[PDB]
Amino acid sequence: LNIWEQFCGWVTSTNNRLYVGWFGIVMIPTLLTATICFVLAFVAAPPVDIDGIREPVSGSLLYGNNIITAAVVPSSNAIGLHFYPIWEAANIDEWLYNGGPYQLIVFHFLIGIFCYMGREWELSYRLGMRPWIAVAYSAPVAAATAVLLVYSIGQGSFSDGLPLGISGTFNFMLVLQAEHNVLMHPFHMLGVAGVFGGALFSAMHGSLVTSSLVRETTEIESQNRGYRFGQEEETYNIVAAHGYFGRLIFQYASFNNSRALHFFLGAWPVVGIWFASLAVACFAFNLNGFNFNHSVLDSQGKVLNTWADVINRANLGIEAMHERNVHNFPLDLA
Amino acid sequence: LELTEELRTFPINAQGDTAVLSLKEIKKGQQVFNAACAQCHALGVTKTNPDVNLSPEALALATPPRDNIAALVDYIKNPTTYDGFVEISELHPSLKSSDIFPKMRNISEDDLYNVAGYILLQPKVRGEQWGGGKY
Amino acid sequence: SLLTYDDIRNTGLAVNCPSLPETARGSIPLDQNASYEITGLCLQPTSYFVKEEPANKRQEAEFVPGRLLTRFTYSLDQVRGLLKFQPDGSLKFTEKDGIDFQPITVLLPGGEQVPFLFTIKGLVATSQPGLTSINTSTDFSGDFNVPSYRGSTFLDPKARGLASGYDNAVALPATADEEDYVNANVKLADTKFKAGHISLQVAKVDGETGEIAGIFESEQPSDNDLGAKEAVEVKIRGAFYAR
Amino acid sequence: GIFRFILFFQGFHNWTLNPFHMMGVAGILGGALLCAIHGATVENTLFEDGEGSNTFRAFEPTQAEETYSMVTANRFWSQIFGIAFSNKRWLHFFMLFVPVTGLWMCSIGVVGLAVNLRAYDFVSQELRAAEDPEFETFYTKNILLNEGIRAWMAPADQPHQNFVFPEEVLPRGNAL
Amino acid sequence: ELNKADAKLGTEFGKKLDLNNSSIREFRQYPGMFPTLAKMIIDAAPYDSVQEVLEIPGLTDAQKEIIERYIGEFTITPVEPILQEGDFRLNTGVY
Amino acid sequence: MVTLKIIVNIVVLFFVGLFIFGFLSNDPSRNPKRRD
Amino acid sequence: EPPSYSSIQLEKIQEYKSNIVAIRDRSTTELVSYIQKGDWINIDNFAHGPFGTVLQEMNYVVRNLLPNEQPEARKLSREVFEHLQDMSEAAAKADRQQAAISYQEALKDLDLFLSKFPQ
Amino acid sequence: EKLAFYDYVGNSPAKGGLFRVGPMNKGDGIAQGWLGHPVFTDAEGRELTVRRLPNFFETFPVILTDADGVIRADIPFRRAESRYSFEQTGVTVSLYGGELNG
Amino acid sequence: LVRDQKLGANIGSAQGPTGLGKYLMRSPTGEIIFGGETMRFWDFKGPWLEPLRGPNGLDLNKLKNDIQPWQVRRAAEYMTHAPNGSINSVGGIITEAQGFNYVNPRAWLAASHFILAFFFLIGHLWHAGRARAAVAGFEKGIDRETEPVLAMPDL
Ligand code: CLA
Ligand code: CLA
Ligand code: CLA
Ligand code: CLA
Ligand SMILES: CC(C)=CCC/C(C)=C/CC/C(C)=C\CC/C(C)=C/CC/C(C)=C/CC/C(C)=C\CC/C(C)=C\CC/C(C)=C/CC/C(C)=C/CC1=CC(=O)C(C)=C(C)C1=O
Ligand SMILES: CC(C)=CCC/C(C)=C\CC/C(C)=C/CC/C(C)=C/CC/C(C)=C/CC/C(C)=C/CC/C(C)=C/CC/C(C)=C/CC/C(C)=C/CC1=CC(=O)C(C)=C(C)C1=O
Ligand SMILES: CCCCCCCCCCCCCCCC(=O)OC[C@H](CO[C@@H]1O[C@H](CS(=O)(=O)O)[C@@H](O)[C@H](O)[C@H]1O)OC(=O)CCCCCCCCCCCCCCC
Ligand SMILES: CCCCCCCCCCCCCCCC(=O)OC[C@H](COP(=O)(O)OC[C@@H](O)CO)OC(=O)CCCCCCCCCCCCCCC
Ligand code: HEM
Ligand code: OEX
Ligand SMILES: [Ca+2]
Ligand SMILES: [Ca+2]
Ligand SMILES: [Cl-]
Ligand SMILES: [Cl-]
Ligand SMILES: [Fe+2]
Incomplete structure (x- = not known):
């Protein structure tokens, strides 16, 4: 009808194969640029100087290293927190040596998932669903924006960020255990309680309906066949699954109704992990986990060892060995 | 050990004599150690000048020696270098410089007398403590 | 801008360029045999870009390629230094004694290495041609300094392999341990060739400037490789006053 | 006490980056x-x-x-x-299926660690960590961090052997 | 190829201080050498002699009195372009 | 590169420009029920 | 109420006056030649530096001297500050004889403080 | 030499990894000869020995100690403040027996 | 740096442990800044060391002979009062023993709003679902009979 309304009427239309609608028009270009640059710089980037002094570390597959290593390695300590586009360097070879392409796949990737946040909201309004699924996606976006962005703000430069590769991540975590002590911090400890709870409740809820399935097939075929997709009758009875678990544990402490059950399935890792995401986000301003170093003591004052200084004797060692050339002054407070 | 009296003996004056210290003045000496003797003397190391440790391997070598706690309350009355050459009351908390360092106003001589008694009781009960601390 | 006024001398790159005087090549300040209120500012934004490449195919394969600076704009050093002395006849000595020096540059030539260049001014003792009254925007300053290293006795490689402390010659291959060859990490106190000219030479603020030609050694990363040869040529940007 | 046993398995075995543990992180986080x-x-x-x-x-x-x-x-x-x-x-x-086969792949990794078949070492990426200081990677950055475990906490973790160290045998990177 | 650092540690630099390439906290081990006495020593006279110091300009006769108390506790080593280089004397790596 | 910077600066202002008056033209009237 | 400053002035207040008298005889220096010829931000070096220690130093007339004449001695020590606000903020004016008459005011108050309070 | 071959770290079955694949002769090569047993003496005697490297390490730092356990020599990782180095102590090696005897 | 000045070693000549200047190297855009790991905070413009900012940056004409005893003792206090906390009262590096306590309430208030800044993005997104479904009428779920997705065409 109208030419600009011919656009808004394809982009907001709900019969496409994939939904690129209004959050997608920021997403789909600025995620494909984060895809294509990361796939290219995983294999053929030059060495990039992570620590910010002189020595350039290699993270690309033509430089002799394998899949379980070799991130696109982050920016330099020399550029700090400055906005470093590809057009500020005097050539491309100055850009790749100074930790260039990480800021191409952080500032595009983070805006590529913050519009994947609202896109899941957008289709739930584009159908008649109740739209409460973007709030479930704030649980791993904040897992992916505390460590990429927010920890790289308050600690200092963009060098202290996640090296987006598989054993670049493991080098980050031991530094965070070294630099300010992840494990003895309750907001991380609330996170794994959501995750190990979310580990069990996947294999708890997913087991028992797979247990309490009704009989519609015979033995020889798969028992995952006797019903058609989208039927009105249930594949399983909740009344038999109730009193199984009521007879395993307290009868009073089961979940009788399934819509109260599935909320708690959608609560426990989701409210858990944005404590752990807020752990690293409150780690970002150097509000750290506590130390029980030298805590118990004799009436002399002679130091009794606990598990916490055995933790710290491991934590002294990674702190006195990570970034082994830059520190010229005896505190690593930067 | 029970922290008995004769392990809390240390020479309080210049080169000739000692004294016995009771229990409760050490704990307020510990309390003023964690208030004003605190941000640059955690674990006996000195964070701004990194080799002026409070170990008695090194506290004896600063002349005149800083083991006598009447000398040590004089060395917070009049701080100095290792040789006694110049005062460093620009750069150090003192009672000579209370107008510069305002935290030294709510303190006395006897409130320094026990933190001088505190600071060398700690290497009497631990070796690693009040040392480099790397190990 | 009229003058710089340091808050506008933030990230705009009007900042790594010291004193440029006016076009007046007629200042003869005429010193005699005494001491000096010894000179200021002295120092260089090191770039044209010229580099000699290693031959390996013997006696040919000279003839310089150019190079690209693969890193930011801190090829510079600044304000101290330069005790000046007039010896018995000519040759007009120059002593550096305690200046701010040695920034470190990384380049790549056509050929995909990254040799770590070192613009060092460590103890220049500068000779000079025959008998000058004073510099006339014509005379040639030329000698060498001594250069330092890359590993300044603590720069570990990634298997902690230095001489000066730091885990002698091997870590992880425990039975092929003491056979490798790259663990002799020795330091040196070299001398080479360098030239520095003069071209502008103002009268009132009395700052003299003009070209340079530095020829250095490359990196020896606690003694893996042999050095390359680099003709670094840029303006000097000195400033002179005296007794 | 588990948290000591965590940092035990980082330094003495490199329990991260062997592949049997890394399916378990795909099991639990995929399960979550x-x-x-x-x-x-x-x-x-x-x-x-x-x-x-x-x-x-x-x-x-x-x-x-x-x-x-x-x-x-x-x-x-x-x-x-x-x-x-x-x-x-x-x-x-x-x-x-997704966290139960996560733990089972994680369960057969520590039985390799029981006889300490660790796979901390790569057969590659070490000989030109020895010959070549120009070869600069995250894995050789990570393997010196585990040396930061094994000579720092081991006199204090295990006083069985009475390991005592004279403070210049410990790996210290720099001024820290 | 003796790696140029431990070989200097064998010739009395590991044993006593040496005044040429000695660290500044080596002077802390003797009573009365730190900062205002070792500042004139480490910057000016690492020349050739155990007895040439006590005759450097910059100290008094009370300042040379501490020098003669521990005069036999150093030998002058030959100079080193590994250990004097780097401004390593005034600020080392141990803290 | 300054020749490139404007070309990237066009396409951010094109896509965010077609996001900021995307929602401005009815975006609560294609919510498949009442007032669709 | 204490008249006798035996060690109270002779260690403290005669070093309180001695450090800013030492900046004072120096002060006909590069700083006057900054406002003679041509150096804008090295005056702001001096006002927060050597005159930054002329004022943070000259601050404990409360904490050392005679509490009856203390409230009349605050604003003597405030007018020396607040005139030197016009010294550093006429550097963005780019006209160095508004700052030159600001520096001549520091003759009228600093040595007038140094003539006063020998107590 | 069979008794000396069983007193080697490189025949103890703890070391070896999951993906360091192959025979033990890909780890060391072929065993050629014993070359004796080291005996470490200082400038004074003071005999001292090395009995170190337990199994679940990979890189044990070299310590040299006396009969009761006080350390007399090591390998200094930072040679600024060494007091127990090899060079100041002047340790000698007596290599007794084997191929390289005396 | 100025501790070194008392010692007297010349600042410019020395090369750190790693080739760079131990004290005074140059930032990527020309300002002579402090060396080491301090290259990230090369934009520091606090009230002290603004009398060390020369024309380019930290000028070495005025970095020597013009440090004041007030100027260093603020930075001596600010070194040990770095924002480095525990949960409870522990201060300084995490590895370091808890001799003294100071949480530095810059840091101790910065994270506390970031708990509440992120949580208010949670509820805003979770009210925008219910508000958009308030006018659309399916805040209680989809209908039994006129399900809107069965009216939609197949893929
Ligand atoms: C012996 C087996 C065992 C047990 C009992 C635990 C138990 C625990 N671990 Mg642990 N852990 C184990 C093995 C074990 N782990 C192993 C093998 C590893 C790997 C090496 C870890 C690694 C690990 C980490 C890294 C962390 C924990 C943490 C925790 C605690 C919270 C976890 C959580 O909420 O789970 C989720 C599951 C649920 C919430 C379901 C409920 C389970 C609870 C615990 C049972 C309640 C029982 C009740 C109070 C008893 C009274 C009965 C009642 C009817 C009255 C919890 C005490 C975390 C912590 O610090 O918390 C203190 C933490 O950070 N563990
Ligand atoms: C993204 C992070 C991440 C994730 C998701 C995982 C995931 C996992 N890790 Mg892992 N890990 C990581 C990072 C991670 N790792 C890092 C960085 C390190 C350091 C290198 C480690 C080091 C590590 C170790 C050392 C081990 C794991 C193990 C595991 C597995 C957990 C086993 C478990 O829950 O059993 C939980 C425990 C049980 C099921 C035992 C039975 C206990 C019963 C069920 C509870 C009893 C309840 C009773 C009422 C008591 C409660 C009351 C009590 C409060 C009093 C799982 C695969 C373990 C593994 O794979 O071994 C098989 C293991 O040993 N991890
Ligand atoms: C949001 C960013 C992000 C991404 C993409 C990954 C991805 C991965 N992590 Mg990881 N990680 C992250 C953040 C991230 N992590 C953070 C913030 C931490 C804490 C610091 C960790 C800590 C961590 C540990 C401790 C471990 C991993 C592991 C893994 C791998 C398998 C885990 C898995 O199956 O996930 C479950 C999720 C899914 C199955 C959904 C599918 C997503 C797939 C896995 C993404 C594939 C990644 C790849 C780059 C995408 C390419 C697409 C192409 C078009 C460009 C996988 C490559 C494990 C590993 O090494 O295994 C090899 C492991 O041990 N990570
Ligand atoms: C349990 C039986 C057994 C035992 C202990 C060994 C042990 C050994 N063999 Mg041998 N071998 C076996 C079975 C066995 N083999 C079989 C069945 C064959 C025929 C295929 C061979 C063929 C063979 C050859 C040809 C050679 C050896 C050699 C060797 C020795 C070198 C070490 C090695 O290769 O480890 C390497 C071990 C690994 C790399 C571990 C593999 C781990 C697998 C891949 C994990 C699988 C995980 C799985 C994919 C995940 C499941 C998915 C999930 C979804 C469920 C070693 C003593 C060599 C030798 O010394 O001979 C002179 C040699 O040349 N073997
Ligand atoms: C000596 C001799 C011979 C003795 C024997 C004879 C004798 C005298 C016996 C008497 C002794 C006796 C009876 C007891 C003594 C022993 C004793 C006290 C043992 C207790 C030990 C102990 C600590 C027990 C507590 C641990 C325990 C069993 C459970 C922990 C419970 C807990 C805190 C959390 C469980 C987690 C939880 C709430 C899970 C539910 C959430 C969830 C997702 C459910 C999934 C789910 C739920 C549904 O609801 C339905 C519907 C479906 C679909 C579904 O997915
Ligand atoms: C250059 C390039 C590209 C480089 C990339 C290389 C690189 C850096 C990384 C990639 C390397 C990589 C992938 C490493 C991982 C290797 C690894 C550990 C693999 C796992 C292998 C293995 C044996 C693991 C053991 C455990 C295991 C089986 C895990 C499986 C994990 C898994 C499949 C998790 C599923 C996660 C997932 C997508 C969940 C969402 C499920 C989903 C779509 C639900 C949708 C849905 C929900 C509803 O509620 C309803 C109602 C309906 C109807 C519905 O539909
Ligand atoms: C001093 C301690 C600290 C104080 C500060 C903290 C106070 C917290 C108080 C919280 C008040 C609200 C609780 C209930 C919320 C709710 O609406 O649930 C509603 C549902 C349905 O209840 C349904 O409720 C129905 C009743 S009615 O319809 O609501 O009237 C009925 O059908 C039936 O009972 C049941 O099915 O409750 C449940 O699903 C049971 C789960 C337990 C309660 C929810 C907890 C959420 C998960 C745990 C989160 C932990 C965080 C960390 C995780 C790692
Ligand atoms: C931006 C918008 C577009 C997103 C692009 C990315 C989308 C990718 C979606 C996954 C593709 C399908 C995979 C399952 C293939 C498939 O067809 O699944 C089909 C399956 C549904 O199966 P059905 O319900 O049809 O099964 C019918 C029964 O009869 C079973 O036979 O979906 C899942 O199980 C999802 C869980 C596994 C999903 C695994 C995700 C893996 C992510 C990628 C990891 C590897 C990457 C390697 C990189 C190096
Ligand atoms: C009232 C609390 C304090 C006491 C009792 C105290 C005590 C001492 C003592 C006894 C010494 C000499 C140690 C020796 O000779 O070996 C010393 C040195 C030193 N203290 Fe403190 N101190 C205190 C507070 C501080 C604070 C807050 C700082 C930080 C500004 C500090 C910085 C120093 C420095 C830098 C030295 C070394 C002087 C030098 O460089 O030569 N002190 N202190
Ligand atoms: O570099 Mn990356 O990193 Ca986490 O810390 Mn602070 O700075 Mn270093 O430290 Mn410990
Ligand atoms: Ca007080
Ligand atoms: Ca020595
Ligand atoms: Cl590191
Ligand atoms: Cl540092
Ligand atoms: Fe369901």
């Missing part, structure tokens, strides 16, 4: 999504049997008609993610 994403959509597709405003009023337990859609939920995930569970069973069998 599949109960989170399945907990969302049953609370996103609901069926108007109540007339009040909270949803889990008037859900009968003796109710044969199914309380979530699965036709709108398949239409939701075929568009957003592009792939979607096109039958309501094996949505629950996958939630059983």
